[PDB]
Design a binder for this molecule. Structure first.
Ligand SMILES: Cc1ccc(-n2nc(C(C)(C)C)cc2NC(=O)Nc2ccc(OCCN3CCOCC3)c3ccccc23)cc1
Ligand SMILES: Nc1ccc2c(NCc3cc(CC4CC4)co3)nc(-c3ccccc3)nc2c1
Length: 332
């Protein structure tokens, strides 16, 4: 494949001839383009200094390994990955190609009002994607409206591109080091609550103000949850806050679907051991119009053994180069 060059907002791009009409989108740096081989509008992300440090190199390998493995309708997939290099000695740029979506859920929630029917379809697609992601032993940790891309037909894709702490599970705020996958479910509840009211549910100014807003809704942790908190520092700070009662969500999300209020009651739970999972939430009556267990697939098992390895930069670079060369595009 022959490459061409052009500068687009300080960053120079070397892309194959198949990608035309490059247009800057945001900032790695992303460009919108047209793929003459497939006829699709695509998004091309150029990784910025992929091997500047051990942190960058392993991060580069992690993202390429993740995107190559994601093959689900509601999760961002990899259409192509290329580099202008002809060998490992000159391998310094990595480009990632995916579908071009219309916008993100952040634009829709602040520019449009969503019917309860639209909330069902949008939240169902998130939970459908989360079940696929969680089945591969992967936690997103960064779910928020700006990480969810939506088309004009309300088709949604999860990606990992508005404060993140507003959607962070409380066990992440207190820096618990043994949380589970339901930290994403807490984020879904905060997102679902925002689609129903148009307001951010927990607009905290800091980590402490975030927990104060959370406790005003969910109430004081009970004796069962207090038994399972290992940090004496956090366990004492929780016992230092005045006893807040748990608000009834029907009095908070008024005029909302009774099934929507019940699902939020199962998602916005402090005790992560009792928080509803992605698979269980798909079976909730709120998604009866869309739920189909035979069309909610799980993922092929994903090898994360590299995360426990301590390698050099050129070793991470060489491993990334192998994944670039071994990539097989999906058929049309
Ligand atoms: C270190 C690291 C590790 C993993 C990730 N990671 N994790 C995920 C999962 C969890 C959802 C599978 C996905 C990602 N990576 C991404 O979501 N990467 C991307 C974000 C935004 C983009 O372009 C946004 C612009 N948008 C594209 C499509 O919609 C229209 C415009 C991208 C464009 C092309 C290629 C990748 C993009 C990210 C970083
Ligand atoms: N088995 C479980 C189940 C839930 C746990 C958990 N849940 C999240 C949480 C929420 C809160 C409420 C704080 C706002 C006051 C405290 O912890 N935190 C923590 C935790 C929090 C801080 C430090 C160490 C552990 N451990 C949990 C163990």
């Amino acid at each position: 494949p022959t490459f061409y060059r052009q500068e687009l907002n300080k960053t120079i791009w070397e892309v194959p001839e198949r990608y035309q009409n490059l247009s800057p989108v945001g900032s790695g740096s992303v460009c919108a383009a047209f793929d003459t081989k497939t006829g699709l509008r695509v998004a091309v992300k150029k990784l910025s200094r992929p091997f500047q440090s051990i942190i960058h190199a392993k991060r580069t390998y992690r993202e390429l390994r993740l995107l190559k493995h994601m093959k689900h309708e509601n999760v961002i997939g990899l259409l192509d990955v290329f580099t202008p290099a002809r060998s490992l000695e000159e391998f310094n740029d990595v480009y990632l190609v995916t579908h071009l979506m219309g916008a993100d859920l952040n634009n829709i929630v602040k520019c449009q009002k969503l019917t309860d029917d639209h909330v069902q379809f949008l939240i169902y697609q998130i939970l459908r994607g989360l079940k696929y992601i969680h089945s591969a032993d992967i936690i997103h940790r960064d779910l928020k409206p700006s990480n969810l891309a939506v088309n004009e037909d309300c088709e949604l894709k999860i990606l990992d591109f508005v404060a993140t702490r507003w959607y962070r599970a409380p066990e992440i705020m207190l820096n618990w080091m043994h949380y589970n996958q339901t930290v994403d479910i807490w984020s879904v509840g905060c997102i679902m609550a925002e689609l129903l009211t148009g307001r951010t549910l927990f607009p905290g100014t800091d980590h402490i103000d975030q927990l104060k807003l959370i406790l005003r809704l969910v109430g004081t942790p009970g004796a069962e949850l207090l038994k399972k908190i290992s940090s004496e520092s956090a366990r004492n700070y929780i016992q230092s806050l005045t006893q807040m009662p748990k608000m009834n969500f029907a009095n908070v999300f008024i005029g909302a679907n009774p099934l929507a209020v019940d699902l939020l009651e199962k998602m916005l739970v402090l005790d992560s051991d009792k928080r509803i999972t992605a698979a269980q939430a798909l079976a909730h009556a709120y998604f009866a119009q869309y739920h189909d267990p035979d069309d909610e697939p799980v993922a092929d098992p994903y090898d994360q053994s590299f995360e426990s390895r301590d390698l050099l930069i050129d070793e991470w670079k060489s491993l990334t180069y192998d994944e670039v060369i071994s990539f097989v595009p999906p058929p049309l």
